Amino acid sequence: TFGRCAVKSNQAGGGTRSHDWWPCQLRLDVLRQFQPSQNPLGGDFDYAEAFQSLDYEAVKKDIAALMTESQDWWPADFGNYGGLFVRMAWHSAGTYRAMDGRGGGGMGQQRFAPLNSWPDNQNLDKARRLIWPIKQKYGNKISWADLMLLTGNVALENMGFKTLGFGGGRADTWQSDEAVYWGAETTFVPQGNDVRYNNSVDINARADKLEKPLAATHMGLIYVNPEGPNGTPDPAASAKDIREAFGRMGMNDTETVALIAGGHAFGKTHGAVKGSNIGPAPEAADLGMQGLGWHNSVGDGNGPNQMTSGLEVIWTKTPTKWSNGYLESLINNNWTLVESPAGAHQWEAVNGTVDYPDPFDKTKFRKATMLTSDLALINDPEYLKISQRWLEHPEELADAFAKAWFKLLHRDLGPTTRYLGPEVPKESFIWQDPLPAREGDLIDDADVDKLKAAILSTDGLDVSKLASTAMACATTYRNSDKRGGCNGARIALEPQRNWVSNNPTQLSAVLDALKKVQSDFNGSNGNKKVSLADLIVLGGTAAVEKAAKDAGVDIKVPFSAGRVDATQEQTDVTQFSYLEPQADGFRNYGRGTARARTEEIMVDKASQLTLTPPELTVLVGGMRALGANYDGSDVGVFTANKGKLTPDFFVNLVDMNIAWTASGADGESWVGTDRKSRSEKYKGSRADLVFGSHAELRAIAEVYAENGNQEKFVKDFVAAWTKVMNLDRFDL
Amino acid sequence: TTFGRCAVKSNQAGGGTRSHDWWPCQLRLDVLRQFQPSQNPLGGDFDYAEAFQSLDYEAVKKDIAALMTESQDWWPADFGNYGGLFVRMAWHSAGTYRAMDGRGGGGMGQQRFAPLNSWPDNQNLDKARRLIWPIKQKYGNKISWADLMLLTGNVALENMGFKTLGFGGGRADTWQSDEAVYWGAETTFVPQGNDVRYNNSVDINARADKLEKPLAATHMGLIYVNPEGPNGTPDPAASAKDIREAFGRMGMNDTETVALIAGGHAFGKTHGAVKGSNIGPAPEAADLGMQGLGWHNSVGDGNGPNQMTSGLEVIWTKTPTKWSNGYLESLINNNWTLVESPAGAHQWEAVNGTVDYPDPFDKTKFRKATMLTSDLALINDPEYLKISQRWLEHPEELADAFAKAWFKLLHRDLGPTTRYLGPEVPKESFIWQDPLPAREGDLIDDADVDKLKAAILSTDGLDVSKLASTAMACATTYRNSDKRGGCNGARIALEPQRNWVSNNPTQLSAVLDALKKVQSDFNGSNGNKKVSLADLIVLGGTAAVEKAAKDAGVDIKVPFSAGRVDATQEQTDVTQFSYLEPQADGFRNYGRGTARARTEEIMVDKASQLTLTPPELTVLVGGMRALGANYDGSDVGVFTANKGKLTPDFFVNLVDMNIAWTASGADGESWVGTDRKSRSEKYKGSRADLVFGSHAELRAIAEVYAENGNQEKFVKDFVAAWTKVMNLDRFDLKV
Ligand code: HEM
Ligand code: HEM
């Protein structure tokens, strides 16, 4: 009954579906998201252009004014929505996972299922509705994705905390991103974590064993449980969860303390009435709620009766003004465990001063309070040292918070060339994967023609190696956080140059050869200079073009010059470790895990490259035709014409005179036997054979295997190649 | 519950708990995101009709005929001839059609995708499709899989001595599983797969006429009926009642039903040589080594004499590769006894019969006559028996009926005659094709259209609201699944549509009289040029939209494509058109849903049949409200003080937080919008209205059109969507 509606609809997709009958079969759903035809702004809409015409300062002015314009349907605590807005922006950005680069604020997904209805996002439906009039006013020129974060940034600045600045540039998305692995649990917090801890309830011991790549301790939470691990009010154990979760989001100890102490300078939690008073979350609510949820039946359900987390904590004596009150209270008070009005565990300074203000009554005051997760920061040796230092040196907290808040909001925005607006911070941060300005003057078409000829006749280079190296560099790109790609020539730097998937000894020979081409060009062409990044892409591109010519198809394969070379200083080894592939179908590398098959990993990667199923399919078949495996093997290379861009991979894959059988125990290797001669003809992988198994992929394989479609195959391959090579070209 | 759940929980490529898992009752927009041009490997600009016109059609047929007797060692041909197998392939491809909702049929070639590639009734048709693949490989883009599967069946019949009426190509391939079809709610396949569709009744005779609408098969995973009898009970009389119900649900009468069954079962045989335990997973569940095939049989080589498909082992005639009257002769002239097949299934044998039915792999070995329970059905029902007895003595009458029924079977979802391609399209026009006449008079030109638009708008009893409402009422009868309905034919003026309560018959009559006056004034006064009522209905709506835009401050060209013709009542069958009558219409705020199909679910289903994207659906509803185009001219959803002007007021007012929305009725269908400051009721809304302010993805679109400054865009988008919908059935126009 989990995942099933009590009433079974017979329209609009109702009825038992293919995925119900065969739930283990590979699904191509993730390659069919975010289609231009589905975007109401149109496929031609240029968000960057719209945003650059935006009256940015006027937007900020209107946001600042909104903060203290209380709306009767959701009255502002202390007459100021600032804290709520900061929470909205920190939950939008706060879903990010550094390992797989998914989550974060970059797609504005908080406004769709499932994030719109996660327990941790309770009442952020109200926050989003409060800023809608600003979205309405400025139209297409500011996205929801940008606006949700800009609102939080402006809120901080209008509560006495100057930030480093801000960068716009997040284009809106138009459907729920159902590609994200948030976990496999079938419940939300307070449950929602049996799978991610492999059924362990040992809260200390399990803390650093959180299922990869997850970055939250329960399904439906941003990071950790505010009442402690599994609701156990043990601050020391909470600190271990915090380090794990924030670390999985790419934040270290300093950053983590700065973000929590920074954030909890502002506003308050809400736990005025028990949860039974609260209606369905937005995705479960009736039409009358018009996109809102968690209707509270006590009074008007708002103001003094607000119920969000079930906790009732006010961290500072000035919740609308930046201060050092969080650390001062945390460290100076004696804490006692108490129940909130809703029944949740929190901490109170029961013999402290009664001077914490009430959000709706200026004559009423409270004692100091904290969450278990706040007390964590003084119940761990490293956090305690940081907290103690910043108690005495609040300027060090302020510096660290400004930097960590900027990172939080912009960690998935991608290269600096994507950042829009008049207050982009000038400092270049390591997590931006920075790139230098170009060297010398840009190569032109005459230079490109000369370079192509040289590259295709240089020691150590050939069509196979050139195509393979270019693709290896390209497929580090992932659209979720806009990291990776060919710009920077980061395949030539650590850690990429020593990834097993890049066949390091072969790679070094290829890069030395391209560096020789570079050295010959640079200094002998006046002030014209070519980057290694451009040479890697041009080499692959020239190889594809010649391979097409050899196959009998004369096509101009386009090349877009202008990539720059990153320095190793700009290329953090830990940050780039996250882009290392477990398997890569384009170069027939690697193997699956106990959780994911090789072909699933391929479809996942394709989705991160924004590829459609035909683009995925044509690229695999072409790479095999080119002999572009990572190790130069013949696995999947079903052709007697290696290096010629024919559809032989598909023709031979679907030849019924070949019988395919498993060879390896692990399911990863397959043999193709000529049924007439009884001799082994081919070796294949799961990435190869899926194209002859899955009914939708095989339908595409058939197109390329059909008589008369040899030129179509080349044209489609060249289009897909160009798309993949240029994914990171935000500079253009 | 393990159903619908993989034992291994993937963490890639969409693995993980999903939104629909948490909130499975929430409206899903999936069906409006299928078949997108980007997903088509041939490209969105691929014109299949142009490709097919250049096909060497005669050569394809010659090659199919050659293939029939070229036995492949991995699936040897029965009697050295794949004809029976190919006829079955084509009759299962076409045989999923349901007349009521127009879904299923062969026109999308969906047998090659899940779930149809793995339905138990399609067992071993994976082999059949693989056998014809070399033909597809040879002819490439110029013949679709959809056309090839059916043409192969047609060519097979003809080469085994049954001349068909002809054939029409024109079915463009599709590129993903169509998950918009309600095949049923059961979580099992045949031999189970039917508790829901009979509402737990197991009385097989009594329940036979009570099959859940719109379903046309007696179990999930079957084409029509169970060949062993209802719920596997070998009672021919009850089987006959299932057959009548199922074939009736597919649009076939008694004569057509007997013709199709007796006609098909002249050929080939069934396969039930070994027990089902020897059979591996269906194609969607099979390992990579099967390369798209399934049902691997572990006995011997799994094929030839060991073939196992349905579990039955029946050979109907003494010449399974040649047209004959052997089926009815055996059926009526033998006495039948209940026996078991080698796989343990119920079938019938003439145990006192001649031992002269040929073995498929030994030309010197023979068997007695056999029949299925579903064959014996044809002599255990009074009406079927009458037909069977007649055709026993007059096989020429069976031949005529089968030729007509087979053509209907293969082409029932192909749409208008103008869609049919190739050199042997039958010349006879059949009622199930919804025929249209040839045009009368020369085609009106741009100047004529401008004159007619001005005439229409200045005609008493015509206004923007009524013109737009009438045009959309006519247009939304279109459905892409079987390419029926639409504005061509002006069938809104004919029965049954002119009396549809959803069309406000009294208002419609007056509107049509006015358009007929415009027609009368034009025709005979403009030389040889004549305009149809169908063109005037669409042009009226189009002029209304143009005027409504102009009245909103926007000068926009609203395209119009002339050339529609007017159908006669004789070309417009009441039964066939009753299937297009809506129970709810979101564009015109008519009607309501039921428990199992909410008002907003019906709207999304309808949108999917119009090929609309979510933005197209959304802009059309909002514009219709702005135009005041409700079926009855009510103010429900008309959230504007500028009714008849094409503005995005619907959206702007819908999302105004000063309005609080509350249910009025008990059934959740009526809503009131109250101004929260003044406490006064301002608006009345339906579920079709309010879903756009509730669903997170639909609301995202509503917001776009509610945004300050997007007035022009709204008008531009409405006009594009209007044009699309008005022209859906214009297969007569090139491109
Ligand atoms: C250990 C990690 C954290 C935990 C467990 C946590 C927990 C919570 C909880 C339970 C609430 C109350 C929600 C409600 O009932 O209204 C809250 C509120 C809030 N949080 Fe955090 N938080 C964390 C980190 C952060 C961070 C990193 C920031 C931003 C930099 C932040 C900013 C805020 C703000 C401003 C509020 C007040 C919202 C309002 O006034 O309505 N928190 N937090
Ligand atoms: C009451 C409706 C029908 C039922 C229950 C039914 C049942 C069956 C079954 C169980 C098989 C055996 C599958 C196997 O084991 O290989 C079969 C075979 C076949 N059917 Fe039908 N059938 C029906 C109507 C039709 C129609 C309408 C046609 C086409 C006009 C048709 C044409 C064929 C042919 C040619 C075969 C032989 C396949 C071969 O030789 O491999 N049947 N039928």
The DSSP secondary structure of A218-247, one letter per residue, reads: STT-SS--TTSGGG---HHHHHHHHHHHHH
* Cis peptide bond N-terminal to A114, omega within 30: yes
- Contacting residues for B301 by C-beta, under 8 A, at least 6 apart: none
- Name the token pair of B218: 């007696």
CB-based contact (8 Å) between B205 and chain A? no
Distances (CA, A) of A64 to A129, A155, A167: 16, 7, 18
Cα separation, A74 vs B676, whole angstroms? 13
Distances (CA, A) of B121 to B229, B286, B357, B427, B534: 14, 17, 25, 34, 43
A156 CA to centre of own chain: 25
Count of beta carbons in the 10 Å neighbourhood of residue B440:
12
φ, ψ dihedrals at B338, nearest 5°:
-75, 120
CB-based contact (8 Å) between B720 and chain A? no
Decide: A654 and A693 in contact? Cβ < 8 Å: no
Cα separation, B110 vs B106, whole angstroms? 7
Angle formed at CA B691 by CA B687 and CA B695, multiple of 5 degrees: 150
Cα separation, B390 vs B393, whole angstroms? 6
- Name the token pair of B511: 């509107």
Beta bridge partners of B357: B367
Residue B188: closest CA among chain A residues belongs to which residue? A21
Mutate to test the interface with A, among B101, B288, B711 (most CBs of A within 10 A): B288
SS3 A375: helix
> Which is nearest to A535 in space by CA: A523, A522, A518?
A518
Cα separation, B562 vs B538, whole angstroms? 9
Distances (CA, A) of A593 to A500, A583, A590, B8: 17, 10, 10, 11
For each of the domains in chain A, give its residue range(s) and CATH number, in order of start.
1-182+393-428 (1.10.520.10), 183-392 (1.10.420.10), 429-584+709-732 (1.10.520.10), 585-708 (1.10.420.10)
φ, ψ dihedrals at A661, nearest 5°:
-135, 150
* Cis peptide bond N-terminal to B214, omega within 30: yes
Give B22-75 as a DSSP string.
H-TTS---GGGSSS-GGG-TT-TT--HHHHHHTS-HHHHHHHHHHHHT--BTTB
Neighbouring C-alpha atoms within 13 Å toward the C-beta of B423 = 8
SS3 B219: coil
- Name the token pair of B182: 């309600």
- Name the token pair of B292: 């798209």
Nearest to A179 among B14, B668, B699 (CB): B14
CB-based contact (8 Å) between A1 and chain B? yes
DSSP 8-state code for residue B529:
B
Residues B347-355: contacts with CB within 8 Å, 24+ apart?
B347/B228, B347/B312, B347/B313, B347/B314, B347/B371, B347/B372, B347/B373, B348/B234, B348/B372, B348/B373, B348/B375, B348/B376
Neighbouring C-alpha atoms within 13 Å toward the C-beta of A347 = 22
Cβ distance B22 to A693 less than 8 Å, yes or no, reads: no
E strand or H helix at B396: helix B395-411
φ, ψ dihedrals at B510, nearest 5°:
-65, -40
Cα separation, B92 vs B563, whole angstroms? 37
Angle formed at CA B708 by CA B706 and CA B710, multiple of 5 degrees: 70
Decide: B54 and B142 in contact? Cβ < 8 Å: yes
Pairing of strands B362-367, B357-359: antiparallel
> Which is nearest to B637 in space by CA: B682, B589, B707?
B589
Cβ distance A112 to B30 less than 8 Å, yes or no, reads: no
Cα separation, A131 vs A144, whole angstroms? 9
- Contacting residues for A458 by C-beta, under 8 A, at least 6 apart: A513, A514, A516, A517
Residue A712: closest CA among chain B residues belongs to which residue? B42
Decide: A176 and B19 in contact? Cβ < 8 Å: yes
Cα separation, B344 vs B312, whole angstroms? 8
Decide: B256 and B391 in contact? Cβ < 8 Å: no
Task: Please count the residues of chain B.
Answer: 735
Cα separation, B704 vs A550, whole angstroms? 50
Cα separation, A392 vs A496, whole angstroms? 43
Count of beta carbons in the 10 Å neighbourhood of residue B137:
17
Q: Is the CB of B654 under 6 A from ligand 2?
A: no
φ, ψ dihedrals at A540, nearest 5°:
-60, -45
Cβ distance A20 to B9 less than 8 Å, yes or no, reads: no
Angle formed at CA B288 by CA B282 and CA B293, multiple of 5 degrees: 40
> Which is nearest to B660 in space by CA: B683, B691, B626, B687?
B683
Cα separation, B499 vs A275, whole angstroms? 53
- Name the token pair of A693: 């198994």
Cα separation, A462 vs A447, whole angstroms? 20
- Name the token pair of B275: 């027990």
Mutate to test the interface with A, among B291, B616, B710, B713 (most CBs of A within 10 A): B291
Cα separation, B620 vs A489, whole angstroms? 49
Cα separation, B48 vs B139, whole angstroms? 13
- Name the token pair of B574: 């009441």
- Name the token pair of A390: 């910043």
Cα separation, A109 vs A143, whole angstroms? 12
Rg (CA), chain A: 28
Cα separation, A298 vs A58, whole angstroms? 38
Cα separation, A688 vs A650, whole angstroms? 10
E strand or H helix at A519: helix A504-521
Cα separation, B183 vs A608, whole angstroms? 34
φ, ψ dihedrals at B101, nearest 5°:
-100, -5
Neighbouring C-alpha atoms within 13 Å toward the C-beta of B529 = 17
Decide: B710 and B648 in contact? Cβ < 8 Å: yes
- Mutate which of A120, A264, A330 for ligand 1? The one with the most ligand atoms within 8 Å of its CB, which is A264
CA-based torsion, B599, B600, B604, B605: positive or negative: negative
Decide: A219 and A182 in contact? Cβ < 8 Å: yes
Count of beta carbons in the 10 Å neighbourhood of residue A334:
11
φ, ψ dihedrals at B23, nearest 5°:
-130, 70
Cα separation, B331 vs B15, whole angstroms? 53
Cα separation, B229 vs B232, whole angstroms? 5
Cβ distance B23 to A612 less than 8 Å, yes or no, reads: no
Decide: A150 and A60 in contact? Cβ < 8 Å: yes
Count of beta carbons in the 10 Å neighbourhood of residue B397:
14
| Secondary structure, 3-state, A88-139 | HHHHHHCCCCCCCCCCCCCCCHHHCCCHHHCHHHCCHHHHHHHHHHHHHHHH
Decide: B16 and B153 in contact? Cβ < 8 Å: no
Decide: A536 and A486 in contact? Cβ < 8 Å: yes
Decide: A145 and A108 in contact? Cβ < 8 Å: yes
Decide: B342 and B314 in contact? Cβ < 8 Å: no
- Contacting residues for A519 by C-beta, under 8 A, at least 6 apart: none
Q: How was this structure determined?
A: X-ray
List, edge to edge, every strand of the sheet that includes A336-339: A336-339, A345-348, A369-370
Decide: A391 and A328 in contact? Cβ < 8 Å: yes
List, edge to edge, every strand of the sheet that includes B337-340: B337-340, B346-349, B370-371
Decide: B587 and B601 in contact? Cβ < 8 Å: no
Helices (H), B169-299: 236-249, 254-264
Residue type, A220: G
- Mutate which of A260, A314, A345 for ligand 1? The one with the most ligand atoms within 8 Å of its CB, which is A260
> Which is nearest to A324 in space by CA: A402, A245, A387?
A387
Nearest to A30 among B14, B179, B220 (CB): B14
Cα separation, B338 vs B347, whole angstroms? 6
- Contacting residues for B518 by C-beta, under 8 A, at least 6 apart: B452, B455, B456, B459, B536
SS3 B90: helix
Residue type, B283: P
Cα separation, A255 vs A438, whole angstroms? 32
Cα separation, A564 vs B41, whole angstroms? 34
SS3 B532: coil
Cα(B587) to centroid of ligand 2, in Å?
43
A553 CA to centre of own chain: 39
- Contacting residues for A402 by C-beta, under 8 A, at least 6 apart: A161, A162, A163, A164
> Which is nearest to A370 in space by CA: A412, A327, A323, A407?
A327
Cα(B310) to centroid of ligand 2, in Å?
10
Decide: A657 and A668 in contact? Cβ < 8 Å: no
Decide: A619 and A720 in contact? Cβ < 8 Å: yes
Beta bridge partners of B683: B673
CB-based contact (8 Å) between A126 and chain B? no
Cβ distance A15 to B183 less than 8 Å, yes or no, reads: yes
Q: At what angle do helices B711-726 and B533-551 cross, to 10 degrees?
A: 180
Q: Max Cα separation, chain A?
A: 95
SS3 B670: strand
Nearest to A689 among B6, B179, B288 (CB): B288
Angle formed at CA B351 by CA B347 and CA B353, multiple of 5 degrees: 115
B296 is in an annotated binding site: no
* Cis peptide bond N-terminal to A190, omega within 30: yes
Cite the annotated binding site of A for heme b by residue number: 264
* Cα pseudo-dihedral B513, B516, B517, B521, rounded to 10: 180
Cα separation, A85 vs A67, whole angstroms? 8
Residue type, A612: T
Angle formed at CA A703 by CA A699 and CA A704, multiple of 5 degrees: 120
* Proportion of chain A in helix, strand, coil states, percent, rounded to 5: 45, 5, 50
Decide: A106 and A173 in contact? Cβ < 8 Å: no
- Name the token pair of A560: 């877009």
- E strands, B183-334, are none
CA-based torsion, A659, A662, A664, A669: positive or negative: positive
Count of beta carbons in the 10 Å neighbourhood of residue A143:
24
Cα separation, B282 vs A406, whole angstroms? 53
Beta bridge partners of B75: B72
